[PDB]
């Protein structure tokens, strides 16, 4: 269900912070979010499952799909093929923003 709550039908935007504010990103602040579950390294050439929005290095998820097992390595949902995934350039961009490589 995508029905909007009473708070939701009315909610107003969370305005952007536009001052010199610096964000302190410590090594774990985004560890879970930016790590590939398969290689345990930082995501590279992110590919993302369409069904469950879970992210993997392109080479990692492709290798795992070649290694037989047609599941999302994260939640077990059916993956037919590479076409069940999509490259996630935006995710790569955020990562390159914070940690240029």
């Amino acid at each position: 269900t995508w029905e909007l709550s009473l708070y939701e039908l009315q909610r107003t935007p969370q305005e952007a912070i536009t001052d010199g504010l610096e964000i302190v990103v410590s090594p774990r602040s985004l560890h879970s979010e930016l790590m590939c579950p398969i290689c345990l390294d930082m995501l590279k050439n992110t590919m993302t499952t369409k069904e469950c929005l879970h992210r993997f290095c392109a080479d990692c998820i492709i290798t795992a799909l070649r290694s037989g097992n047609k599941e999302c390595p994260t939640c077990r949902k059916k993956l037919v093929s590479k076409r069940s995934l999509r490259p996630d350039p935006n995710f790569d961009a955020l990562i390159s923003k914070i940690y240029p490589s």
């Binding site: 708070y7 969370q14 952007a16 504010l21 964000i23 302190v24 990103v25 993302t48």
Partner: protein
């Protein structure tokens, strides 16, 4: 490996184009991987079956079928934007008291 980054440098990666604000309840079109506030995209998809950004078709007849909550994205937003999470939470209490 700790790094400091200007919030205005992160903003493009953390903002919904529909409302111009920070992602709240980030929701992602699985067709193209473009994201929006849950409320912003659900309302928009009521009168359009094409992505607001890339204009690809979300679904033949029912766009909602092809969008997903993006927990990872929202968690990123809530962890980077100081105060954002508390503020949104307060916004909901202050509202549920009044109703």
């Amino acid at each position: 490996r700790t790094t400091r980054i200007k919030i205005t440098e992160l903003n493009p990666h953390l903002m919904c184009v529909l409302c111009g604000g920070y992602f709240i309840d980030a929701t992602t079109i699985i067709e193209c991987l473009h994201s929006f506030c849950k409320t912003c995209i659900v309302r928009y998809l009521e009168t359009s079956k094409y992505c607001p950004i890339c204009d690809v078709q979300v679904h033949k007849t029912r766009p909602l079928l092809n969008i997903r909550s993006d927990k990872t994205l929202q968690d990123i937003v809530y962890k980077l934007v100081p105060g954002l999470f508390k503020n949104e939470m307060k916004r909901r209490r202050d509202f549920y008291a009044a109703h």
